[PDB]
């Protein structure tokens, strides 16, 4: 049912569908080292991708329904030059007729144009003054459906955002060739990332959109704050989803010391461009592989690892005394060789028992494979102290709403641009 499906292969991009669309790539198109299937396009003339379909699959009808889907990552807009600067990123318009997707300051726009030059636009808007954003510099699954008889709808991460009737539009022509290049951007230092572009010749409903979302989400692999793969031997800042205004900190080294959630977070401001919350505050959490036999650095589900903790550019280890009062027992950062038999092993969990994708969670366990429990925080005399407990497991078994067992890993990224 898919007509175009650009996927990575041995140093090239290949169409999965049985049409053999010709693909040509410029000399300045980049690829991520870990996830080469993600494509980086910069604001230059040579950073281009042309895809040429066949004459038998060119959209030239006017009752024909169609859908597109992709994943996009857009960096933060830093200064006022980006304001009122709508620039096209994907174009399929010839003779002033076709479909296109473009980006503006906090906006993703889908545009349809027929031969009578009538424009229909569907927009998704995300703010930039939020403390913590779900869209800024993070991967977004965008799927757009077009029913020529009822409406045209946009879906962000599988949920409907906007919909606009297109029954007035006439016959829509489409180019023989589809564009991938930043066009019309005045900012000379603005880039995007796109991956997993698919085209279908019929309108997707919510069910197929959700299955496509889960299929392309890679639920079996842990993800960081930016949506990229989680890796070993890389420092990550820690974020609690239930309590996102505080950062992980330590006060003393050893069993007598505890790590807690200290706040409030700082802010990064550019005077009506963004008012975001500082993400590089606290103590870095490095992941060390212990029993994962995979050769790659990618952290997968159910991996049993160790968690080093960076205090004054010195590496310590997560451990707790399995035997103390209560179930919600304190976590501590201690010297690497002096740990002995304290519980180190952490199981990384990304998807639930049924296979539904959720955020990153850590399950502390002992040397005997007994679940100490999920890692979270508990308030002891007005201090949010990091604790491993089986209360979260009990709530999960009861299908109740857990409180604080969900964590987020934030590596340092160029698309965020915060000063460390």
């Amino acid at each position: 049912t898919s007509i175009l499906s650009i996927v990575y292969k041995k140093d090239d991009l290949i169409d999965l569908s049985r049409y053999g669309a010709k693909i040509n790539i410029g000399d300045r198109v980049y690829y991520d080292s870990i996830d080469k299937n993600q494509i980086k396009l910069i604001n230059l003339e040579s950073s281009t991708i042309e895809v040429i379909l066949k004459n038998a699959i060119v959209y030239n009808s006017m009752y024909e329904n169609f859908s597109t889907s992709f994943w996009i990552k857009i960096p933060k807009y830093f200064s006022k030059i980006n304001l009122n600067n709508e620039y096209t990123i994907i174009n399929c318009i010839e003779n002033n007729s076709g479909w296109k997707v473009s980006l503006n300051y906090g906006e993703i726009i889908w545009t349809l144009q027929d031969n009578k030059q009538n424009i229909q636009r569907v927009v998704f808007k995300y703010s930039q003054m939020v403390n913590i954003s779900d869209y800024i510099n993070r991967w977004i699954f965008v799927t757009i459906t077009n029913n020529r008889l009822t409406k045209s709808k946009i879906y962000i991460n599988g949920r409907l955002i906007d919909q606009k009737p297109i029954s007035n539009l006439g016959n829509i022509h489409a180019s023989n060739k589809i564009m991938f290049k930043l066009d019309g951007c005045r900012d000379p230092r603005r880039y995007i990332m796109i991956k997993y572009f698919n085209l279908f010749d019929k309108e997707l409903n919510e069910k197929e959109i959700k299955d496509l979302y889960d299929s392309q989400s890679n639920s079996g692999i842990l993800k960081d704050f930016w949506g990229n793969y989680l890796q070993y031997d890389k420092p990550y800042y820690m974020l609690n989803l239930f309590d996102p205004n505080k950062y992980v900190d330590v006060n003393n080294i050893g069993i007598r010391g505890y790590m807690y959630l200290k706040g409030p977070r700082g802010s990064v401001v550019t005077t009506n461009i963004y008012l975001n919350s500082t993400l590089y505050e606290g103590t870095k959490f490095i992941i060390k592989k212990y029993a994962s036999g995979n050769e790659d650095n990618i952290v997968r589900n159910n991996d049993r690892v160790y968690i080093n903790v960076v205090v004054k550019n010195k590496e310590y280890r997560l451990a707790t005394n399995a035997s103390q009062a209560g179930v919600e027992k304190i976590l501590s950062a201690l010297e690497i060789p002096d740990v002995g038999n304290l519980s180190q092993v952490v199981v990384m969990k990304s998807k639930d028992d049924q296979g539904i994708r959720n955020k990153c969670k850590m399950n502390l366990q002992d040397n005997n494979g007994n679940d100490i429990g999920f890692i979270g925080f508990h308030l002891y005399d007005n201090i949010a102290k990091l604790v491993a407990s089986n209360w979260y497991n009990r709530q999960v078994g009861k299908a109740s709403r857990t409180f604080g067992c969900s964590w987020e890993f934030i590596p340092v990224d160029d698309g965020w641009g915060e000063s460390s």
Partner: protein, 592 residues
């Protein structure tokens, strides 16, 4: 009907005067004088507490504008409610009973306010303390009056106003000896803090408790017993006065010759009792506005309102003008540095009262600096670094910040007015109030001294009044002191420095006290014993309302002109004196 009841009151008053003459003046009267003086000292103390604790309570409670003014004005609203309430209740429950209840309420809520952490709760506690203390003056004066013979009533009643000045002096001394120790940071509960001004509040709440303890040992006034149809205990109290007086004299052998005293003939349950009390109090209040007392009541209302308005307006106006003059002198000394280009170098300093304009600092790290009234204008900060910056009354206006970091600084968003920040980071902001709270330092000391001086100004005139009350009269003393108050009000223009303001405050305070004494004595003597506390409390509530109005009006006029306060005070005092000159003479009469 009316004639018989009038004759009964007249004969009862005459026999009561004869009994009081037989008992004579002595130790009992002086003991009751000291007890009621403590009760009045509590009221004198109560009016200074919020004014003395506001400079610390603004920082300790994040008090903004429209909240400091309400805190300053709350004691007078509470007093206005309490004076009327307790004055109405004292003619149906008894002077001593209502005095004990009101003083206990004041003590309880003043103790509660000393530990209260919030603002609205502090407002409620202080309003209730004002309600408790509002009923002190009317009940105390009407209670002391009913033990005095006609030979010396103005003198012995005017001697009772020394304790108000004593309470003012006590408040000033306690503020001077307690508040300046800001180091005291007693910790009971992590979220709560115990500073020195709370200790000052406790020490100011003490005298009300002492007054209650002293008053528990005094008997009810016999006149209230006689009015309400209770004859045995009135006779017992009058006898007790007799034995106390003559045992103190040195003749503990004579016998109380009075055998019978003429007495006014008397003609769900909780709700019924409350309704009956309310109806009776309303009847007393309306009978205060009766055919016999309608000229008197309106003239007393005029005199009370005008004198209270003028006095409280000027009393709150003098310190405000001293503060305004000090602020003007401070702003005259401000230094200005227009333009300065600074390269890579670390900055430490403590700057006071400076304005730097058009600065350009490139890669400058400001470590550990305290700013007091320092303003940066039209400046540009690039790749700067602010660490351990503490600032009061410091603003960054027209400033542009690029790639700067504010680490461990209290430079909140309200300190960047019309500024532009680009790629700037705020990290580990210090705990502080969301808005400005100003700062008061050593300048508090003189304030206490000033208050002390004002209270001392009262000391001479009191003496003179107490030594002359029965010699000239209440009307003449009232008029001759109001006229001098008006003259001193006109003399306000001949002063523009702090010393001149202090001298003018001393002059006005020393002049108006004789008029206040005369008004107290005249209000006591002009009403029957079955309506004395009700009328006195209603007039005192009117006085407190006029105090609120005058304080607001005179504080709104600071720094604008010196003609409006002078005109208002002089006009009000002239009207009050004109109305007072038309009052009847009560000297040389039985307490009827």
């Amino acid at each position: 009907g009316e004639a018989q009841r009038r004759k009964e009151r007249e004969e009862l008053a005459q026999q009561y005067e004869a009994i009081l003459r037989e008992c004579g003046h002595g130790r009992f009267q002086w003991t009751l004088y000291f007890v009621l003086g403590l009760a009045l000292m509590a009221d004198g103390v109560e009016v200074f507490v919020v004014g003395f604790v506001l400079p610390s309570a603004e920082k300790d409670m994040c008090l903004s504008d429209s909240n400091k003014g309400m805190l300053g004005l709350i004691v007078y609203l509470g007093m206005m409610v309490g004076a009327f309430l307790w004055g109405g209740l004292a003619d149906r429950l008894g002077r001593r009973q209502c005095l004990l209840i009101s003083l206990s309420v004041n003590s309880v809520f003043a103790f509660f306010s000393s530990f209260v952490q919030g603002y609205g709760t502090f407002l409620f506690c202080r309003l209730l303390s004002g309600v408790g203390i509002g009923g002190s003056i009317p009940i105390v004066f009407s209670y002391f009056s009913e033990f005095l013979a006609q030979e010396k009533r103005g003198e012995h009643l005017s001697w009772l106003c020394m304790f108000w000045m004593i309470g003012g002096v006590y408040a000033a001394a306690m503020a001077w000896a307690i508040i300046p120790h800001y180091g005291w940071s007693f910790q009971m509960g992590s979220a709560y803090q115990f500073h020195s001004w709370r200790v000052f509040v406790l020490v100011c709440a003490f005298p009300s408790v002492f007054a209650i303890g002293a008053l528990t040992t005094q008997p009810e006034s016999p006149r209230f017993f006689l009015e309400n149809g209770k004859h045995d205990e009135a006779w017992m109290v009058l006898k007790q006065v007799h034995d106390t007086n003559m045992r103190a004299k040195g003749h503990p052998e004579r016998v109380f010759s009075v055998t019978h005293i003429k007495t006014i003939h008397q003609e769900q349950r909780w709700g019924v009792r409350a309704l009956s009390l309310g109806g009776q109090v309303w009847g007393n209040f309306l009978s205060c506005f009766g055919p016999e007392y309608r000229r008197i009541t309106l003239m007393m209302m005029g005199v009370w309102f005008t004198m209270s308005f003028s006095y409280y307006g000027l009393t709150v106006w003098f310190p405000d003008m001293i503060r305004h003059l000090q602020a003007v002198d401070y702003a005259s000394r401000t230094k200005v540095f227009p333009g300065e280009r600074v390269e890579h170098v670390t900055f430490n300093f403590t700057l006071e009262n400076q304005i730097h304009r058009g600065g350009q600092y490139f890669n400058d790290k400001f470590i550990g600096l305290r700013l007091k009234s320092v303003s940066f204008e039209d400046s540009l900060f690039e790749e700067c670094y602010f660490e351990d910056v503490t600032s009061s009354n410091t603003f960054f206006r027209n400033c542009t910040f690029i790639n700067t970091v504010f680490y461990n600084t209290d430079l909140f968003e309200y300190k960047f007015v019309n500024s532009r920040l680009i790629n700037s980071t705020f990290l580990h902001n210090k705990e502080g109030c969301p808005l400005d709270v100003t700062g008061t330092g050593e300048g508090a000391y003189m304030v206490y001294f000033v208050s002390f001086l004002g209270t001392l100004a009262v000391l001479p005139g009191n003496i003179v009044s107490a030594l002359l009350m029965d010699k000239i009269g209440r009307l003449r003393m009232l008029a001759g002191s109001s006229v001098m108050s008006c003259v001193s009000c006109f003399f306000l223009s001949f002063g523009n420095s702090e010393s001149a303001m202090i001298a003018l405050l001393c002059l006005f305070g020393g002049v108006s006290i004789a008029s206040w004494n005369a008004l107290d004595v005249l209000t006591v003597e002009l009403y029957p014993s079955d309506k004395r506390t009700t009328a006195f409390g209603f007039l005192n509530a009117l006085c407190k309302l006029a105090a609120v109005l005058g304080i607001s009006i005179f504080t709104s006029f600071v720094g604008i002109t010196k003609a409006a306060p002078i005109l208002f005070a002089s006009a009000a005092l002239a009207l009050g004196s004109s109305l007072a000159l038309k009052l009847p003479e009560t000297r040389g009469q039985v307490l009827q």
